[PDB]
């Protein structure tokens, strides 16, 4: 994904139909319909692991998982038995955008929704995939779901968010993807201002917007879960480690140690797929072995901050069986 | 395969020792090359061995004089370390590396054996040593210091070559955990003692900084030795510390140049060749506490002074104020 000699710029054509409670476009909730289709190792559908799993989903969205490797066409089910989707029966997920447009051009991306009946993709657009979890699958939240995205929050979240998906989440995509010193400086740059920024924040507050967590939180945890691990050294995002950034890796360790935050997260796959499918910045595929994870499961007193982070609901239980992450593909026990 | 001839006080292999006549050949990238550097700053022989640098980057010729007026060496007047070898041997085959001592009158090179060069520097070249200068290399203790810097050489100097060069997953897998077994083995030791061997700082010291001193800069991230940074390793980042801010050391120490080369001649590991903009280099300056285990860096002997001029390191290339 580099272009050489040029800026790191995301192609972003997605399929924007809704799955929604009115069913306006074609697509209405209901269990037992829709599957969702994600990967350990990509931090947009990682939201959509974490979302799902706040909000006691498990049991009406089914889940597929896709390997962190794959050749030109992008996603396939190759950590499964038959090397095929347990439901959907497909060997690679591009089958299923075909199913629904022949010839589909743009981006084979996670994560993506997929109605179960037709084996065809209803939509791919992250940003909305989550908010609708929270806002059109209301009658089937779990009692003690919490308020992700409430009403008289989206403005504060919706800004926060924008800021960070610029600067962070696609910050260290346009450290690693730049093509050129000067793109990678000017990245660099915007990057670790916006990290300062919201030390700033987060030094005053337990969470990014108000009392408790919300969608904003979960999207800069998926990239904070990446950094040590991946952007570091694979996108040279390296003034400094996770680490050794004091308030950002306390507030890290708060949500990782979070029911339904460190139990989606796979650091063998995550690892894996970074430096093995981007053969174009690290041609070895070499995967390090390090870091050593065991500091995320240190102490980090951000409970003296106050806040509360279901705010009148109950952590989730742990995942169901099949979700569970390897213990040798987390941190050691 | 290195050309093992030695100037030596004696003058055995027909290379004695005298002021003015040798030039010593480094680049402020390569850390055999900076161990020379050190040892010669810490022994005051900066005004009777001269001293030329090459630039970071270069073809497949090696070493060039690219940061210099001209392009060409001051003294020596070529424009690439190569000729200096073709010079004494007109074929030359083997691998053409810094550093390497340069007889000035003649432009050809004497030695290039980067191990033997620095016990040489303390042995042969006694009768130019400064007021002050330390014992790096004292009858009394080579058993020791040989030992622990064979340990380290293997396992650590060439322990993160061994990783970043590795051609496959399994013997990278191998070299990762030989060199963090070393540093485990090396933390125990300097917990309870100021420097590897002893009371002073020796060779074993300097061969051992010159490492440190790129691993954070590169080997954690280029050549994903990655366990950890060496700012999370308490024992040996303060040992670290301690001798990057003893004179001699610290001030040999050109960062820029040193990634500069490391991400930029290295394309198969690194295809776009983009030189990170980290690691801050400020935690370099911050107080250690290695003053409280004791030792006499010097022992008997002085720090040396600040460096010549043309040796200082341009301020945006260290570590900023």
């Known amino acids: 994904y580099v272009t050489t000699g040029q800026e790191f710029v995301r192609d972003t054509k997605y399929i924007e139909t809704r799955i929604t409670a009115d069913g306006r476009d074609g697509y209405p909730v209901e269990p037992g319909r829709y599957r969702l289709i994600a990967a350990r190792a990509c931090p947009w559908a990682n939201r959509t692991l974490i979302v799902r799993r706040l909000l006691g989903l498990e049991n009406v969205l089914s889940l597929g998982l896709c390997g962190p490797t794959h050749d030109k066409n992008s996603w396939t089910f190759d950590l499964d038995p038959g090397g095929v989707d347990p439901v959907l029966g497909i060997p690679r997920l591009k089958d299923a955008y075909e199913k629904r447009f022949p010839g589909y051009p743009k981006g084979i991306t996670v994560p993506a929704v997929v109605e179960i009946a037709t084996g065809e993709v209803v939509t791919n657009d992250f940003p909305q995939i989550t908010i609708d979890f929270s806002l059109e699958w209301t009658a089937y939240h779990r009692d003690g779901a919490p308020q992700l995205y409430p009403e008289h929050l989206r403005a504060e979240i919706d800004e926060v968010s924008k800021g960070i998906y610029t600067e962070v989440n696609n910050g260290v995509y346009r450290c690693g993807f730049a093509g050129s010193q000067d793109a990678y ?87 894996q797929h970074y430096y093995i499918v981007h053969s174009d910045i690290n ?47 987390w941190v050691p026990t």
Request: with cysteine; glycine share 8%.
């Open 283 to 329: 041609p070895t595929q070499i995967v390090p072995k390090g870091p050593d994870l065991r500091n995320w499961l240190t102490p980090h007193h951000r409970e003296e901050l106050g806040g509360r982070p279901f705010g009148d609901g109950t952590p989730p239980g742990p995942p169901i069986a099949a979700e569970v992450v390897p213990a040798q593909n």
């Open 185 to 271: 400086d000017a990245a660099y740059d915007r990057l670790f201002t916006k990290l300062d920024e919201l030390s700033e924040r987060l030094a005053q507050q337990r969470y990014l917007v108000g009392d408790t967590i919300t969608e904003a939180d979960v999207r800069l945890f998926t990239t904070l879960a990446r950094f040590d691990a991946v952007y570091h050294g694979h996108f040279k995002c390296n003034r400094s480690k996770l680490s050794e950034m004091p308030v950002l890796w306390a507030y890290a360790r708060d949500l990782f140690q979070t029911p339904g935050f460190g139990d989606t997260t796979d650091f063998t796959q995550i690892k």
